[PDB]
Amino acid sequence: SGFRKMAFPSGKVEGCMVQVTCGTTTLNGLWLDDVVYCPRHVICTSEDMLNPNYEDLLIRKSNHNFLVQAGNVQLRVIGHSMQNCVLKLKVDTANPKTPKYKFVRIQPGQTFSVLACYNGSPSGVYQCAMRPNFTIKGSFLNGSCGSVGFNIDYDCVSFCYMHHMELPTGVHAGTDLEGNFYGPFVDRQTAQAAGTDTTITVNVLAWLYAAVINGDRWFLNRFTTTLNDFNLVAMKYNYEPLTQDHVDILGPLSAQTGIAVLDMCASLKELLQNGMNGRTILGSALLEDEFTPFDVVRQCS
Amino acid sequence: SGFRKMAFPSGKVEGCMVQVTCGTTTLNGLWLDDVVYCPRHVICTSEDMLNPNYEDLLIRKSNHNFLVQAGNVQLRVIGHSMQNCVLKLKVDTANPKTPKYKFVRIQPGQTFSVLACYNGSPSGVYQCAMRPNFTIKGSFLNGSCGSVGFNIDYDCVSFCYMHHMELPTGVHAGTDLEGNFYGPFVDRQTAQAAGTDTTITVNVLAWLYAAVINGDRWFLNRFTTTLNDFNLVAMKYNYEPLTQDHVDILGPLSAQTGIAVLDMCASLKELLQNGMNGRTILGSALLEDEFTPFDVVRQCSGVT
Numbered sequence: 182s183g184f185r186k187m188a189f190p191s192g193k194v195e196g197c198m199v200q201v202t203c204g205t206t207t208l209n210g211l212w213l214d215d216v217v218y219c220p221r222h223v224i225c226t227s228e229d230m231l232n233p234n235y236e237d238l239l240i241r242k243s244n245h246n247f248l249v250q251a252g253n254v255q256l257r258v259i260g261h262s263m264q265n266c267v268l269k270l271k272v273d274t275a276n277p278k279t280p281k282y283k284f285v286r287i288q289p290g291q292t293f294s295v296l297a298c299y300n301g302s303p304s305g306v307y308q309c310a311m312r313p314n315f316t317i318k319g320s321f322l323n324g325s326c327g328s329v330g331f332n333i334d335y336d337c338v339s340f341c342y343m344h345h346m347e348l349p350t351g352v353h354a355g356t357d358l359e360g361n362f363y364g365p366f367v368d369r370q371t372a373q374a375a376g377t378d379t380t381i382t383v384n385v386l387a388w389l390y391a392a393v394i395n396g397d398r399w400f401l402n403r404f405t406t407t408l409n410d411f412n413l414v415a416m417k418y419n420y421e422p423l424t425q426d427h428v429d430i431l432g433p434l435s436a437q438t439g440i441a442v443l444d445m446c447a448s449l450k451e452l453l454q455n456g457m458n459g460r461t462i463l464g465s466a467l468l469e470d471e472f473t474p475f476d477v478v479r480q481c482s
Numbered sequence: 483s484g485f486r487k488m489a490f491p492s493g494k495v496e497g498c499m500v501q502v503t504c505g506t507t508t509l510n511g512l513w514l515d516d517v518v519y520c521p522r523h524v525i526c527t528s529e530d531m532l533n534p535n536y537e538d539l540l541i542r543k544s545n546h547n548f549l550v551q552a553g554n555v556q557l558r559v560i561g562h563s564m565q566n567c568v569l570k571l572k573v574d575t576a577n578p579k580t581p582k583y584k585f586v587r588i589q590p591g592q593t594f595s596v597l598a599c600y601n602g603s604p605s606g607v608y609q610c611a612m613r614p615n616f617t618i619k620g621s622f623l624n625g626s627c628g629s630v631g632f633n634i635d636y637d638c639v640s641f642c643y644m645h646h647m648e649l650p651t652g653v654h655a656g657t658d659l660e661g662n663f664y665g666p667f668v669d670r671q672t673a674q675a676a677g678t679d680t681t682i683t684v685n686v687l688a689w690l691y692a693a694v695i696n697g698d699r700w701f702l703n704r705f706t707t708t709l710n711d712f713n714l715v716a717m718k719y720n721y722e723p724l725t726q727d728h729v730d731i732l733g734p735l736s737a738q739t740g741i742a743v744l745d746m747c748a749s750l751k752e753l754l755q756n757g758m759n760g761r762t763i764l765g766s767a768l769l770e771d772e773f774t775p776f777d778v779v780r781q782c783s784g785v786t
């Protein structure tokens with residue numbers, strides 16, 4: 182028993198991490214089958230941060246301009262193309278460690294594991310969640326671009342994130358594996374502020390249900406609430422609006438504990454009103470919002 | 483920027499996890515070279531665990547009673563022996579995915595990564611710190627016995643932990659890879675309770691340095707202190723005493739940020755007495771003590 186923010190075993194992703202170099206810039210690439218996926222701003226020079234013309238920059242590139250390094254072995258680039266904001270380098274060798282995989286674009290509130298990488302070699306793994314403002318609160322240093330986020334269901338790795346840049350507030354922005362950025366961000370060094378971050382309400386509720394399953398009920402009350410009255414209160418604490426979809430998603434956890442969704446919602450209204458009063462829930466002094474209902478039902482059986 | 487509870491890449495350990503079954507009890511085993519390591523209580527039934535005689539149970543067993551499964555391939559046991567509380571099952575084939583590895587024992591307050599597994603299948607990885615009471619606050623449901631804890635220095639995997647049991651307070655107890663338990667525990671079904679835990683002071687200090695590196699500086703102040711004065715405050719709040727070696731270890735962080743340890747202990751002393759006052763540190767409303775100074779340097783420098 183225990184509730185820890187657990188990341189997925191990174192073995193299937195480590196076997197796909199390579200190093201991509203263009204000019205003086207080195208970042209990470211994802212080697213799947215005979216294609217290497219990496220951020221397109223690897224082809225940017227110092228004068229190209231603010232207003233890069235990626236098409237103009239890419240048409241001036243040949244295959245041998247891209248140096249792909251898998252461990253100590255150099256891969257031969259035989260083709261290259263641009264799909265939105267990711268570069269796709271066709272290489273002469275299929276990755277024999279290519280796992281069962283697919284590309285999935287995720288929604289805010291969804292969680293995933295990140296394999297932090299530098300120079301194509303893995304540094305560490307940690308669990309993340311897509312914030313409502315389409316950023317992630319990860320741990321990235323210079324040279325971590327190309328690090329990927331993923332979920333592993335059975336033995337299939339669902340790649341959902343690729344790191345591209347850090348915003349001035351310390352949060353991080355990236356794309357899916359088709360090159361489409363999460364949120365309104367662009368691979369430009371101009372002023373782009375992330376929206377005010379809010380709490381993933383559906384994740385807090387599932388995390389409160391997990392506390393009830395684990396024998397913690399000190400925060401429950403005998404009040405209920407309407408969906409609108411809860412959203413009127415939750416917005417005042419910068420909580421994400423709770424939708425009817427979120428209510429149906431919490432259905433199984435509600436039936437397991439015997440506590441209605443709007444009953445748990447009134448309990449959350451009181452927790453925001455009172456705080457924790459020196460107490461903890463599942464070991465935390467704050468309300469955790471990076472466990473999805475899917476994580477809770479799976480991890481708590 | 484950013485600071486996260488970061489675990490080591492678990493790929494080198496994933497290629498060593500196998501399933502070990504003795505009768506109806508199945509758990510995880512660590513397959514290194516031609517030997518599979520697993521907890522010795524795999525040979526116990528519900529009545530055996532009440533008061534087991536392991537050498538009696540082992541001398542009854544033979545190689546065929548041990549079912550080792552590596553993925554989908556069965557491994558043929560050709561020998562069995564005991565070393566303290568781990569069972570060493572010699573198999574006919576050496577693991578081709580054996581990494582460069584060492585068996586090490588870690589100190590309380592040091593951190594390591596745990597590859598949680600269920601029936602030889604790795605399901606999750608996370609970062610622990612060995613508590614001063616020699617337990618770990620992990621997430622181990624049934625079927626996780628045999629999961630290993632490890633550190634990676636360069637290419638060498640230092641195995642330090644093997645999960646054996648869960649305690650009634652939700653914490654977990656285990657041994658090193660040589661069978662030596664961590665803490666005053668035994669591998670049998672009896673009334674066992676973890677002692678009163680304390681907070682690892684040197685880890686809290688390293689975590690405050692991580693916040694300063696990350697632009698969180700509101701808790702700094704103009705004051706400094708001495709090691710004896712702070713240790714008086716640490717004992718009052720159930721904090722591990724800060725030794726002089728602990729101060730030397732924090733040396734590089736004190737030089738990177740410019741805040742002396744005793745300077746930072748003055749900040750920690752004020753946080754213990756007056757709280758945080760509605761504010762957070764690295765997005766936390768409590769003092770985190772599961773980051774060693776080496777963990778902070780490694781994450782804030784990009785060592786791979």
Ligand SMILES: *[C]([O])C1=NC2=N(C(=O)[C]1)C([C])=[C]S2
Pocket residue numbers: 208321322323324325326327345346347483
């Ligand atoms: C690219 O690779 C990059 N990424 C990142 N960064 C840099 O600089 C670069 C930071 C700072 C964070 S993340």
Ligand SMILES: [Cl-]
Pocket residue numbers: 286287288291
């Ligand atoms: Cl999603």
Ligand code: NA
Pocket residue numbers: 702703704705706745746748749
């Ligand atoms: Na100070």
